[PDB]
Design a protein around this ligand. Structure first.
Ligand SMILES: [Zn+2]
Length: 182
C-alpha cells in the first residue's frame, strides 16, 4: 500500500481527466492494477493531452509507446498507449514531469500489441517489477476503491474518495488533480 504522499494522478496538476474502471494490465485477470484516463475519450485522429509522472523516480523508455517510472522504494508506475516520448532511459523525474502524450492514432497506441477503443492512457501500479492491486492506493487526496470485475465502473463499487473533502468521485467524470498530498 503506497505512501499516501508519494503519488499524484498521471496528468498535469491543475487539470482534469476522466478515468475508467480498474482492471488488470491485460484487462482480463487479477489483480486490478490499472485504470485508464482521457480528457474527453474521443475518436482516433483527435487532439491528445499530456501524461506526467505520477511520482519521483527513474524512467525506462521501453518503446515509442510505453514508459515506466521506478521509485527507489520499488513502487513503480507503468504508462502504456504513449506517444511523443520526451524522456530518456535513466532520466530521474519528479511527480508532474511531462513524459509525453497519450496516442491519437491506434498504430502508435498499440506499438506493443493489445487492443483499444480510442485515445486514452493505460496506467498501472507496480512494486519491485510486478503489477499490484490499486485497492486503497492514494493519488493526491484520492483513495481508490477497486470494483468487482475488470472495468467495473459502478460508482457504488469503483470510486476515487477524496480524503480531504469527503467527496466521492465516479468513473467518467472530470477528476481534478491538485498534486501530491501531504
Ligand atoms: Zn487500460
Amino acid at each position: 500500500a503506497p505512501p499516501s504522499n508519494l503519488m499524484q494522478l498521471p496528468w498535469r496538476q491543475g487539470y482534469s481527466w476522466q478515468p475508467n474502471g480498474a482492471h488488470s494490465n491485460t484487462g482480463s485477470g487479477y489483480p486490478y492494477s490499472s485504470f485508464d484516463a482521457s480528457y474527453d475519450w474521443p475518436r482516433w485522429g483527435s487532439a491528445t493531452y499530456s501524461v506526467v509522472a505520477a511520482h519521483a523516480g527513474t524512467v525506462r523508455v521501453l518503446s515509442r509507446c510505453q514508459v515506466r517510472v521506478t521509485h527507489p522504494s520499488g513502487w513503480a508506475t507503468n504508462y502504456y498507449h504513449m506517444d511523443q516520448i520526451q524522456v530518456s532511459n535513466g532520466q530521474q523525474v519528479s511527480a508532474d514531469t511531462k513524459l509525453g502524450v497519450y496516442a491519437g492514432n491506434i498504430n502508435t497506441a498499440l506499438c506493443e500489441g493489445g487492443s483499444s477503443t480510442g485515445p486514452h492512457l493505460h496506467f498501472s501500479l507496480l512494486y519491485n517489477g510486478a503489477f499490484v492491486s490499486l485497492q486503497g492506493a492514494s493519488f493526491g487526496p484520492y483513495r481508490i476503491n477497486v470494483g468487482t470485475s475488470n472495468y467495473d465502473n459502478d460508482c457504488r463499487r469503483y470510486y476515487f474518495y477524496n480524503q480531504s473533502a469527503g467527496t466521492t468521485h465516479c468513473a467518467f467524470r472530470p477528476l481534478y488533480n491538485p498534486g501530491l498530498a501531504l
